[PDB]
Every structure is written in structure tokens, then in C-alpha cells.
């Protein structure tokens, strides 16, 4: 994962400071898990990845050239508009997994910062509104027949308002 | 459950069936045995007196005021036995009382094991078909003379014959398999 698309804070751990003669029942167990559960598995896994690296293959990420958007597309020309409703229905999803990440990045930031979520985790929630106030302003009223012509109108009904209110 | 219901009830069976409902609903208020064995021989006294009333009218006026005394002096949660209707185990084991006409669709493999079992079962099924004629005829030859019919069925009355309609009182699912 891209430490930058799915961030993750650096870790700060208090150091071991035992103050009891008794023996910790956790440290012993781990010493076992590490030998009877991890080593055995670790061995297999590696052997997996070397089997992979022999005939290493690659897969790319289709890059879609940008076609002309409905805003510029003849009326009635089903050809151009078809290529332009897809370009949008495509960005209706790319603009949706982005919102999936903010749904996620936050969820983690409230598990990683419990009892402080009220505060420490406000870098995100400020963003979850900076992103939700936008998704609400370009994709929400629309029916289940969402189309670029309708986002073009949902916007342009309001561009009057950012022009009637302003005036 | 076995014997058939009489059409109308007599005076007696109504009185003598209160002596049961009453004494048994007195062991729900009086739990301890002693208190009971006391408070109950005092009950019989109540029934013991007014035993020889010959004045029917009166008798049916003591009975009708007994069963109202009782209805208002009954226990909401009496002691009803574990396996009797209304009980706690009533019809519990009925999920295991399959009706025995179902062993007739068993695969020849299943019935292959359990061999002597089906050797005796085929005998009994021969008994059943061997008498249906003598039975139904009995049931009929002994029919009522165009009179009141009860749910009672006749006994055998001849050697070799089997009590009429005996296939489901006998050969009935075991109570607690």
C-alpha cells in the first residue's frame, strides 16, 4: 500500500519496564508462537515468493485518454455523447472510491486514537466534509439514471444561484 | 384416553370428579404434606356430609354452589403432573413417536439389517389382514338395533378372532422411545 494514499502514523511504544518478579505469561508464549507458528509459516511463504519470481509477469493499469465532455458535445449526436456519458460514468466511480478512501482513512483514525478521537482525529473529519460537501454538490439529487447531462444541469441550476445570489 | 366418553354426565361423576379437582387444587395451596393431609380430610367432610341428601334438587344445588366456591377458591398455578395434558412434558417425546406404517418404505438395504425384526413384523401384518373380514362383519353383525350408537367397540366373542379394530390401540407408538 502507498504509505501516502493510505497513510499511517509513526509508532510510539512505551518500553518494557517490568516491576514484578513473576514471569510474564505473554513473552513466553510469543517465544513459542515465533518458533512453532511463525517460523514454520515463514519458511513456506518465502518458498512461495521465489516460485513467483522465476516467471515474474507484469500487469499494467489501463490509462484512459480523455475524450470531450458533454459540456462540449453536439446535441443529438449519439456518438459523441455516448463516449462522453461513459467518460463521466467512469469518473462517477473514480470520484467514488476516493470517497471510499476517506470513509476508510477515517475509520482507522478513530480506532488508532480512541478516547482522543474527539480531537486527534480531526485532520480527517475536516476532510470528510471538504469531500462530502463536494460529492453532495455534483452527484446527489440525481436519480438512478445518473447521466452527465443531469450533473450538467444540477450544477447549472446552481451556477445561477452563485450568480443570482451574488448579483 | 382409552375408554369412550359417555354422552351425558351423571350427578355422581360430576360430584366425584370435583372431589378430585378439589383435593388436587388443595395441594397447590397447601404444599406441605401434613398441612394437606389435614386440610384435606376436612374436605372430605364437606363432601361426606350432604352425601345422603335424597332431594335431587338440593343435591344439584349443593353441587352448583360447590363448583362456584371452588372456581373462586382455586389455585392459579396448581400441581398438574409432568406428563399430563397441560403439563410440562406433555407431548414432549412425540417427536420420536413415528407411526409405524413408515417402516414399509425402507430400502431393502436398511431392512436387510435388523432381519428378525421384519420377520415378526410380517407375521403381525398377516394377523391384521387375516381378520379384517371377521372383524368388520362382527362390528356389523353386532350393530345396534337402529338405536343409540356409542363409540364403544365390541370384544372378540369367539376364539381366533381379534378384538375388532385392534390395529392402532395395539401396535401404537411407544410412549417414551
Amino acid at each position: 500500500w502507498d504509505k501516502d494514499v493510505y497513510p499511517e502514523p509513526p509508532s510510539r511504544t512505551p518500553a518494557p519496564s517490568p516491576q514484578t518478579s513473576l514471569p510474564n505469561p505473554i513473552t513466553y508464549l510469543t517465544k513459542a508462537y515465533d518458533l512453532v507458528v511463525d517460523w514454520p509459516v515463514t519458511l513456506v511463504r518465502e518458498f512461495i515468493e521465489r516460485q513467483h519470481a522465476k516467471n515474474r509477469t507484469y500487469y499494467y493499469h489501463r490509462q484512459y485518454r480523455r475524450v470531450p465532455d458533454i459540456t462540449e458535445c453536439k446535441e443529438g449526436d449519439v456518438l459523441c455523447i455516448y463516449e462522453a456519458e461513459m467518460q463521466w460514468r467512469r469518473d462517477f466511480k473514480v470520484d467514488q472510491e476516493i470517497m471510499n478512501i476517506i470513509q476508510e482513512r477515517l475509520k482507522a483514525c478513530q480506532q488508532r486514537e480512541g478516547e482522543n478521537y474527539q480531537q486527534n482525529c480531526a485532520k480527517e473529519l475536516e476532510q470528510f466534509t471538504k469531500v462530502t460537501k463536494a460529492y453532495q454538490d455534483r452527484y446527489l439529487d440525481l436519480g438512478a439514471y445518473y447521466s452527465a447531462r443531469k450533473c450538467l444541469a444540477k450544477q447549472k441550476q446552481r451556477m445561477l444561484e452563485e450568480r443570482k445570489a451574488a448579483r | 384416553a382409552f375408554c369412550a366418553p359417555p354422552a351425558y354426565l351423571t350427578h355422581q361423576q360430576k360430584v366425584l370428579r370435583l372431589y378430585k379437582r378439589a383435593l388436587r387444587h388443595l395441594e397447590s395451596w397447601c404444599i406441605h404434606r401434613d398441612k394437606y393431609r389435614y386440610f384435606a380430610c376436612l374436605m372430605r367432610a364437606r363432601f361426606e356430609e350432604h352425601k345422603n341428601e335424597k332431594d335431587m334438587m338440593r343435591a344439584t344445588q349443593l353441587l352448583r354452589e360447590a363448583e362456584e366456591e371452588f372456581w373462586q377458591n382455586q389455585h392459579p398455578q396448581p400441581y398438574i403432573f409432568p406428563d399430563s395434558p397441560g403439563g410440562t412434558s406433555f407431548e414432549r417425546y412425540e417427536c420420536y413417536k413415528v407411526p409405524e406404517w413408515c417402516l414399509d418404505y425402507w430400502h431393502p438395504s436398511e431392512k436387510a439389517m435388523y432381519p428378525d425384526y421384519f420377520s415378526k413384523r410380517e407375521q403381525w401384518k398377516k394377523l391384521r389382514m387375516e381378520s379384517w373380514d371377521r372383524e368388520v362383519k362382527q362390528l356389523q353383525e353386532e350393530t345396534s338395533p337402529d338405536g343409540i350408537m356409542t363409540e364403544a367397540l365390541p370384544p372378540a366373542r369367539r376364539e381366533g378372532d381379534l378384538p375388532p379394530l385392534w390395529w392402532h390401540i395395539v401396535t401404537r407408538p411407544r410412549e417414551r422411545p
Partner: protein, 126 residues
């Protein structure tokens, strides 16, 4: 006090006057009804206990019940009052009730959205 049978919690057998009825007639019906049931009982009990039978005992008393309840209804329908007044309050009554329940809500919602009060926060779905 005195038990008071209601349509539910009915009068028990005991405490019931008619039980305490021994008029000749009653004991003539009470013995004339067992006959019908004994007669029907001895028409079930030697046809179910019949060897050599595979056909389905029918219980025609149940077939007279279903026919009476789903195929003998409309042939016995006569439109009266207490039937059409009550046959319109049931079909259109609530159907008109909820319309003014849903219209008023949907209209309240719409107004508020139009005027700018409804928060619709963190609602990115619908």
C-alpha cells in the same frame, strides 16, 4: 364475586347453567349428538384401520370447509349497506390517510430543502 365470561375467557363447563340441565330434551340431544359422532367415529375407525388400503382417507368435513371459505363466498355476496360503506373505508380509508401522511412529510421535507435548512450532512447516499 362471580366469574364473568367474556367473548374470551368464556364461562367454564362448570359454572354453566345449561350443564346443569337435565330436561328430558337436553338429555335427548346430548345422547343424540354422541350418535352422530359415534356414527362418524365408526366411519373413520374401520376405513383407517382397514388393511389393504392405499387411497387417501378424505375427511370431507375439511373439504366442505375450504370450499365454504374460498369458493362459496362470491356466490353468496349481496351488496348491502354495512358492507359497501365498510367495503370502502377498508380499501380507500388508510390509502387516503397515508397519502396526507406522506404528502405532508414529503412537502415539509421539500420546503425545508428548498429554503436551506435541512442539514443533509454526511449523507452521500440515497
Amino acid at each position: 364475586s362471580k366469574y364473568k365470561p367474556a367473548p374470551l375467557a368464556t364461562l367454564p363447563s362448570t359454572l354453566d347453567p345449561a350443564e346443569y340441565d337435565v330436561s328430558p330434551e337436553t338429555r335427548r340431544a346430548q345422547v343424540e349428538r354422541l350418535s352422530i359422532r359415534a356414527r362418524l367415529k365408526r366411519e373413520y375407525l374401520l376405513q383407517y384401520n382397514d388393511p389393504k388400503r392405499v387411497s387417501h382417507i378424505e375427511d370431507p368435513a375439511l373439504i366442505r370447509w375450504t370450499y365454504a371459505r374460498s369458493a362459496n363466498i362470491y356466490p353468496n355476496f349481496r351488496p348491502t349497506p354495512k358492507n359497501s360503506l365498510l367495503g370502502a373505508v377498508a380499501g380507500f380509508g388508510p390509502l387516503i390517510f397515508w397519502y396526507y401522511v406522506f404528502k405532508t412529510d414529503r412537502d415539509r421535507k421539500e420546503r425545508l430543502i428548498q429554503e436551506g435548512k435541512l442539514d443533509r450532512k454526511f449523507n452521500i447516499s440515497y
